[PDB]
Each structure stands twice: as C-alpha cells, then as structure tokens.
Amino acid sequence: SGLVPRGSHMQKDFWLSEIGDKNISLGYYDDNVAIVLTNKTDKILRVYSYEDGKIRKDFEQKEIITGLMGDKKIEGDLKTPVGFYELGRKFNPGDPYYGPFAFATTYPNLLDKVQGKTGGGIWIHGYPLDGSRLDEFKTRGCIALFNNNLEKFAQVVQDKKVFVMTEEKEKIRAKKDQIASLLADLFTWKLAWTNSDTNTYLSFYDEQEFKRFDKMKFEQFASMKKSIFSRKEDKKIKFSDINISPYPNLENETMYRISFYEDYYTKNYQFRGDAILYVKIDSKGKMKILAEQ
C-alpha cells in the first residue's frame, strides 16, 4: 500500500514497491554513492555512480594489475580481497613505488576480522614512478591503475561516499527480491530486538558461523542476549540511511552487506551510530547474520 501502513517495513512487498524500477544490481542506496567494481579474473576496474537507482559508468580501465587470486586470509598472502569494502580519500603514501597517490580500502572489514583474517594495506594506487614493472605478485594485494588514468579516477571518486566491490571471477549482482526480503528481515529483526523477543531475534543469526570476535561460540552470545533481553525494557529503535550491497564471496553463499544508521532509545541507555550487518541469505531465503556492528 502506498499509504505505508504500520509494519510495512517488515513486508517484502513494500520494499519491492519502494525499489520499483531502480537499477539495484550493485546495491540499493539511500545516498548517492560511487561503486568501484573490480573483477580479479577479467582485470577490469570500473567506477559506477549510483543516484536514486540510476547507474552511470564513470570510469573503466582494463588490464589492471590486482594481487593474487583466492580470497585474502592473512597478511603476506599477496591476495586481493574479495567482498565489499569502502574507499578512503586520496592520500600521499610518500613512496614513489605507488605512483602519484593512493586510496585505502577498508580491508579487513568486520566480517574479515571476526573470521580471524589478518593483513591490511589494500590500496588502489598507480605504478612505480621509476617506470619499473608491476605484476600480480608485486602489488601485495593492492590494485594498480595506470598512472595516466589516476587523475580521472581521483576526479570520479572525489568527495563521494565510495564503496569497493571486488569479485573473484563470477559476476555478482544484487537481485530485487533478495534486497526486498533482506530489508523485510532487517525490520523483523528490529521488531524482535525492540520487543526483547529473544528467540526470534537470535533466529536471524547464523548459529553455525556468526561471530563477534575470533572463535566466539554462539551460546556465549545467546546466553548473554537471553539474560539482557529478560529485562523487557521499553525500547525505541530507528534504522536509517540504509545501504544494502551484494557481497562477493568464495563460500558459495549469497551474501549482502547491510549498512545503516542505528538510533536506540531506552530510559537509562541511549546510543546511535553507524551499524553494519554482514549477512547471508540462507537456503530458505532468510537473513542470517554473520557479523554485526
């Protein structure tokens, strides 16, 4: 219903209507964003601008140099990470090996961290100013663009909210039905949290794989939440600025990142800040949280 009755946000049909005819193939965003899409097999990096569901290709370079194939696990495996990240601002690393400037991705992200991954320093940068050769072993997992393309890259990403989407081989795209059901699940989860409905709340977490820190056990989490939720205090929780993105992976899972602003009120405790769920869609089409900020 276009009147948006109470509970609409928990309804897949509402989100399908809201997405409408938007191109959500690289995500469904509440902000204008840019998406740096790299495919490690094709050696193509593109930047797409997303404005209210209109996609425009603003940058493309073929024959890029990425790091090694396979998803990054540790510092020094030289792999370029697969997944969904963000891009920081142009900076000067102070080393001409990286070309004229560089841009830092956010590897390791929370999901990486709770999975016990290590490493860092996954940047997009250029080629050594001495003209020496690069190859997939020399970038240490970074992505190298031609130095004569970097000014245009810098211009396209400047002053924007910029995400990093790195595929291994398969072309990964979001689907309208998946985004809509994930958003329905997101607000169903919010309702369980609001109502301190512990069993429903916990059912949105992957009992097998969800972790808040390396090697956490799920009962440590469930037991803590059962205790906390037994207080049944009145809660008011608001989600906003929702940016939901397909999450390439090599686990044969359908994964998404759901980033949103969280605004939480109780009488004695309030917080607000940037939140993130890293989730899979399980075999039944249900959201299963793998990592939560």
Numbering used by the authors: 33 to 325
Please quote the paper that reports this structure:
The K307A variant (Pgp2K307A), a conserved residue within the pocket of the NTF2 domain, was also weakly associated, supporting a role for this binding pocket for appreciable PG interaction. To investigate if the loss of PG binding by the Pgp2K307A was due to conformational change, the crystal structure of this variant was solved at 1.85 Å resolution. The Pgp2K307A crystal structure contains two Pgp2K307A molecules in one asymmetric unit that superimposed with an RMSD of 0.7 Å over 281 Cα atoms. The fold of the Pgp2K307A is similar to that of wild-type Pgp2 (RMSD of 1.5 Å over 277 aligned Cα atoms). The largest deviation is located at residues 296–306 of strands β9–β10, which form a protruding lower lip of the NTF2 domain binding pocket. We conclude that β9–β10 is conformationally flexible and may allow variation in ligand specificity. In addition, we used two Pgp2 crystal structures (WT and Pgp2K307A) as initial docking conformers. The catalytic triad mutants (C174S, H157A) and three mutants within the NTF2 pocket (Y233A, K257A, and K307A) resulted in bacteria with cell curvature distributions that were similar to the Δpgp2 strain. Lower levels of products were observed in the NTF2 domain mutant strains (K257A, K307A, and E324Q) relative to the strain expressing wild-type Pgp2. Pgp2 but not the K307A mutant was pulled down by C. jejuni Δpgp2 PG sacculi, supporting a role for the pocket in PG binding.
